[PDB]
Amino acid sequence: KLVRLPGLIDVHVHLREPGGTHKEDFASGTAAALAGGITMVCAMPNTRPPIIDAPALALAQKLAEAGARCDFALFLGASSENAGTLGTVAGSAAGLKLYLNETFSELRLDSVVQWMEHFETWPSHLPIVAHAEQQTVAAVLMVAQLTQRSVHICHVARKEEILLIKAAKARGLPVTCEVAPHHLFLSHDDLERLGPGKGEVRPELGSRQDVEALWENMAVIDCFASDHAPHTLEEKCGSRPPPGFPGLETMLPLLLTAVSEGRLSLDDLLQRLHHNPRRIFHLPPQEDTYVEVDLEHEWTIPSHMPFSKAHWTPFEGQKVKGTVRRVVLQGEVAYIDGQVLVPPGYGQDVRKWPQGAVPQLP
Template identity: 55%
Template sequence: GLFAGASPEDVAHLPALAAEAVALKIYLNDTFGKLRVEDVPTLRACFQTWPRHKLIAMHAEKQSVAVGIGLAAAYARPVHFCHISRREEIELIADAKAQGLPVTCEVTPHHLFLTEADYARQGPLADMRPVLGTPDDVAALWEHITNGVVDCIATDHAPHTLAEKRSATPPPGVAGLETSLPLMLTAVSQGRLSLERLIALMHTHPRHIYNLPEQPDTFVEVDPNATYTLTHEMMHSKCGWTPFAGQQVTGRVMRVVLRGQVAYEDGQILAAPGTGRVLPA
């Protein structure tokens, strides 16, 4: 599904977009692009006029997470926090959940497997929003995956090309679709979480949180024991690179069946261009 993006200029038009959007996304911090909400009247309008049966998702960092939690409490409606990356953020969300507030959250593989040291080494190729955290931040995210506070694993897929990343104004963001499952299967092989928990994080919980329909005859087959090294050349994405190049993983996607048709098998994309569908909102 597609998000509707909140901004002061467009807030009056948002309710009309709700039928075509899976959720409303509000940016409380800087990212790539101009979408950022900094004024209280726009925030109030979003929470008052966006249909209550539709989710509100937030890009919120550090103290902005507290703003999102406060809005969830004030308007008694669910808020989903995208790509949480810091100890202080996940602990605040844990506190809110303990009080029964309607908040959920996700983390990304790049915030689980990379740190600020990788940014120092790779530069713009390891720059994203939120930026990479410290080893202590990473440890906190894993702790709250284990204890159930984290609801979802998300890719935050942003496949900027090498030319863009090497430009004078490199955009933040990295590709994540192809590496997310191998990385998380590696965590399963290391005993950091169970396969059942991974399925909940990457399938069951996201579908329920966003109220997405079931996808009949759609599944992914993996070899959980395949060990190999990620390379740029493996990427099918047009960006053609990954910040995880050189990292050894255990767990390979072998086959993807989409609506009864084999879309991917043994490293080859078999689905014809244009066969993908936007999930209904």
């Protein structure tokens, strides 16, 4: 018997279009999403050009509307120049992403004062998410408190970070967070197999104690999100390997395996891949949309998944129990047993739906 799930949401993907389409584009990345049981994605802004101004957002919107096979929202990215300039387009974005650790020059913030300025100028009712590692989690939480608003922490990867967030939540602070599958299912123990190129990711793979701490503190994790960060094997194995793993096609199989093993419940999974993404980012429901999964069939992750142009995966060799069998999106069969059946352009910008606008006071 198949299990029917609602349309799952991944609030953290890199679809590389514009500017990196040999790694991934909207069409191939959203095919990977559908194959992973994901019917709506939020795409990060560190493209080339980066989505840091209204013209770049306008271009990305059209590229996504023409290429996406599932529904989507597009993040804006904070820069050292664009605080106080995004007000007219802010409501059309998934949210504002701050890169507070390593990034490309155009997204680099050189001073916490620049973080303050973004928290002060970005509309207070709209989401802010941050790449914020180790101490940076505490620092950006401080900025959120000074500006009296919420923040969402991307890919929490360390015992240090989840315990800090746990302490903040105990004090009633408005902070939510997401965890990516590689930080639950990979660790330092895998670096010998992966090698130093493939193993490059930010946040880096943690210790076994880091991984154990995230599982022990599942109650503190609001969302799962893949941080789908595709690069080709040539790039990952070359002289300056970029950080990141592809993950859309492997997320749900990995987590369904954990569910089968009693590590978390089916509800725990659906809170973290459906309900909490909806409520943190004010994402609308998807009419006549659902995912049918098979929890009985055991298989081994191969050297590459069928759809991501990354054409490699760090989870190769792991045994999983859980398969996406069928995806229905907006009343149409979008995916069945390895075949994507909706064309590029079938997906839509959920922020343009009346029910996708973020409610605000007049």
